Amino acid sequence: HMPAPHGGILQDLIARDALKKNELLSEAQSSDILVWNLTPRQLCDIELILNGGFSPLTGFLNENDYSSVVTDSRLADGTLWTIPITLDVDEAFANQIKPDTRIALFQDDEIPIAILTVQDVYKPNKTIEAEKVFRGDPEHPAISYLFNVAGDYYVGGSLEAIQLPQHYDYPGLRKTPAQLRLEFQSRQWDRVVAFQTRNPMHRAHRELTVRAAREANAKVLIHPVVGLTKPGDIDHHTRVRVYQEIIKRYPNGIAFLSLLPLAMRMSGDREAVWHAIIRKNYGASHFIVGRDHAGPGKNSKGVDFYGPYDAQELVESYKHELDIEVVPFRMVTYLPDEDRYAPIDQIDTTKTRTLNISGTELRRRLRVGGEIPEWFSYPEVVKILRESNPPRPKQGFSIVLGNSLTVSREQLSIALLSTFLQFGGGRYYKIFEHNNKTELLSLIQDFIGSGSGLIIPNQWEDDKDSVVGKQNVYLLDTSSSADIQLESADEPISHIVQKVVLFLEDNGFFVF
Amino acid sequence: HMPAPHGGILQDLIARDALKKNELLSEAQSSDILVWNLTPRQLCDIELILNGGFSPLTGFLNENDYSSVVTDSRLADGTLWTIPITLDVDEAFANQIKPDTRIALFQDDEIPIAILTVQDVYKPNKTIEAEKVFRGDPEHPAISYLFNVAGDYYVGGSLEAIQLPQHYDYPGLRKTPAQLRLEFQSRQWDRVVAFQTRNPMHRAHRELTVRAAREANAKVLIHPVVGLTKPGDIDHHTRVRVYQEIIKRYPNGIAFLSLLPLAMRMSGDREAVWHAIIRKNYGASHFIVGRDHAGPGKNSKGVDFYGPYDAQELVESYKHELDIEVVPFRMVTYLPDEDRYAPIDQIDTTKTRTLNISGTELRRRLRVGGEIPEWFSYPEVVKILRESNPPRPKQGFSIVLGNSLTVSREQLSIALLSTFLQFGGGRYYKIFEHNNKTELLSLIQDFIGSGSGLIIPNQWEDDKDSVVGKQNVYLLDTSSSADIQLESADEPISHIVQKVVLFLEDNGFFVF
Amino acid sequence: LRESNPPRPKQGFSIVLGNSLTVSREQLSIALLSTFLQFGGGRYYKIFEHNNKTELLSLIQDFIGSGSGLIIPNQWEDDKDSVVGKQNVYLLDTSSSADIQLESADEPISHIVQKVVLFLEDNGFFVF
Ligand code: NA
């Protein structure tokens, strides 16, 4: 039952180029070879290629495959493939390469990853890519990256592997497709259903998953993404701690945890098919496709990027060709009087109690510090989330003295500092003078991340608002754009202080 | 019974220079008048002088009173006075002043405090002062300050009150002698026993104090020092929270808390007499002098700066002259089977079970996060100290990659960071590059104070060790001076990471 | 009441291998036994062979009453269904009358085991 890789053969480049390692290593570490440092998304991508995770890929797509993928969701030879995997480069580097040029791809400017043999260098129409691949919405994460982070030139080419990107965390937890397939054989695991996730798992996830295992007669592979998920989500370290904990809530010998160095595009539809392909290469006969699978969410005008079922239908439409089975996850609700989750479909809310916790409410219960029902998520998991996302009483913040203020900045700072220290509780306070220095402005969010309260005497230049981070940063000024608005610019310091103290207290930072 | 100020009349200068405030304020901020920025200690002293708390002083001591104080612990006119209150200025400033010169004393370079009418300017023999006043031992906190911080030119002169130094914390809690006496009169309080302290109060302190009140038929005045105590101690904020909490464990209408802006010299012997005088001016008829009162402790060779009972004996020998009663606090111990503290005197240690917790064992339990008995310190009090002095798992730290390391600094830091993030526990981690900059080195301790873990890629110049701070800062090197010593200079990174992890785990920072 | 009528986690049960099964009864039993022992919690497990003996069939409900999990290799004769007691007794077979229904009679033992484990887990006997 274990699926053959996509395209019939596991492109384990690490294993195929084993004997030539030192040979490739040297060439890569020679001063005669042109060097290109891989960006974060590229590092995740290249790992899956050398890995065989992106079978049948063997390098970054050339214009021929890239175009076929963009317009037909297939490689030039017809193989289903929905996400363009290209090596984006800038004009400068582009002008130093031509077909057959040998490039060395490094990590952190010092670790030899692989040797790339160019065969194509083109300047893709990002308008068409954004439209045909990511549905053209300018706010879509992939399209934003496409235009502001991705180089404007793609470099098609074949790769020869030196070593997979270096990782120092979760060793042996990042099993390659070959290792996973071998692990499944050790356990005599025939049928395996894989679960995609870039989020923490709660009881519902544990139940829906065990259910899939039961109905599909397969074992469970919890395959969390730890490379790059949606921008601004929970760090993977925290998620992995949650996974390692929830894995213990499954009957013994039913589930296995393994991390996927994937860099998502949040391209729902196509991404789902891409996900099915990837797990297939990793050895899964079944793939769970959730509601709005890999969906960013809603845009500015509240419009959804993808339809709630777009992903499940797309994968379902290609499953026979992919030779995998799709396990659709229907929306579910909790029935208190039975202590069980059930498909919304079969519930008459008119004659049955139902409980549900939205992501917003959860984010709120972690901000406020309120209890989280044990039926929604396991105790151990909630504790883990509580540590990473502390309630406002344990959160850091920053109070910036507006430019409109005329009071003694030094005195107001001393006054605020002295005042905050009366409340105590654990938070460390500091009058922070940056002097419009980037080396110091870059530390603001670090102190806030540490729960520290910073009193900042002056504002920084607008051409640096990007160096800081708006999170928990409040402006004290007379302007209508301030978070703490003073009626005048020459108010008594005690007047000003009280306004700030009560503001913070109202926002939950101080508790008495 | 309420004593008369020391000298006969309370020198509440603020009250005698009221009808001259605007006038004096003008002169202060005038352009002609010479200005001097009051040092932190000078602020605490000047506040007590203008306050009346230092009666009969009416300004800083001149060479006449000073020498008298130094040799015979009295002022020129005989009046008892053991600690030399003088205005220490640098050479340069001394040469711009002559007798009759009027000076404007400012706080933080912008607040008019008082006008000083110079009477004397001299360069005291600090070798004699350190000897006759503080006993000579160079490691004595007062003698160290005397030479390394105090100016070399004392400026004697009278003072005219503008306003007492500004405080934004604990307003109305810092009552003046005039205010306290009024507060006492309002409560029909005649006999008052004052309790001095620069440390947290535990059940023992509550019991000894209540017992004192009972024996002397007096009310209790908890008079903590909030100015400057012993180098490196518990900030007054934490202590005030402790005081306000324990003050509630007294019978209603028995005790009263008030803060004393005193800058202690930790001059045990003399300072106790000085404290009795100060407390006398504040309206206290009784003063508690404890074992090694205002004592620095032990020097290098483990030799005590003062004798356990030197302070009690000295004040006791001047009490008749001071016109105040001395209340000696005898060493006590806890009796489990009787749930009460009793003097070590009447306790048959042989036939009686006794419990005691040293200041060191308390320090240890707070570092470890161990339990602290209820009989030793009130729960609310422990809570406060725990939050101010977090145990190792909640403590911050720094691992400085030594100079002898030949390994990649970029890769070792990255490996430490990703490894640390696996553990979780609320701590924020950061790779900190200072580039030998002071603006950055000064933040290291702020981060550690915030519970953060810093990974420092390079050591900082020797000429800047004084800018950092030893606390929880460990060096990873090969030298025998390293905190985490490495066998060789080019050990595998994984090998290094483990040595560091297990070191931090053995030291409490990590718990599993 | 909680002591006399324990919740499913502390309740005994019995899994009888249907007559339609073609798998190695000895192996399936060993497999189930070994598997149940991984979960633990307090329940005592036992492969129980009655050999259609009334003296032994009369003990089935006694073991269940003791919270024990019994793995029974074969079914007994219908003219004895009255000697046992249906309480917490589940049949593993292909027939539509079975409590745990297999799609085929020659399924992999690991296939069969998982079906039984998840059945019991769904019925509250195993808690993780
Ligand atoms: Na990137």
Curated annotation (Swiss-Prot), chain C:
Protein name in UniProt: Sulfate adenylyltransferase
Subcellular location: Cytoplasm
Induction: Expression depends on the formation of the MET4-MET28-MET31 and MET4-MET28-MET32 complexes on its 5' upstream region.
Source organism per UniProt: Saccharomyces cerevisiae (strain ATCC 204508 / S288c) (Baker's yeast)
Lineage, opening ranks: Eukaryota, Fungi, Dikarya, Ascomycota, Saccharomycotina
Family assignment from sequence similarity: Belongs to the sulfate adenylyltransferase family.
Subunit structure: Homohexamer. Dimer of trimers.
Protein's job: Catalyzes the first intracellular reaction of sulfate assimilation, forming adenosine-5'-phosphosulfate (APS) from inorganic sulfate and ATP. Plays an important role in sulfate activation as a component of the biosynthesis pathway of sulfur-containing amino acids.
Domain of life of the source: Eukaryota
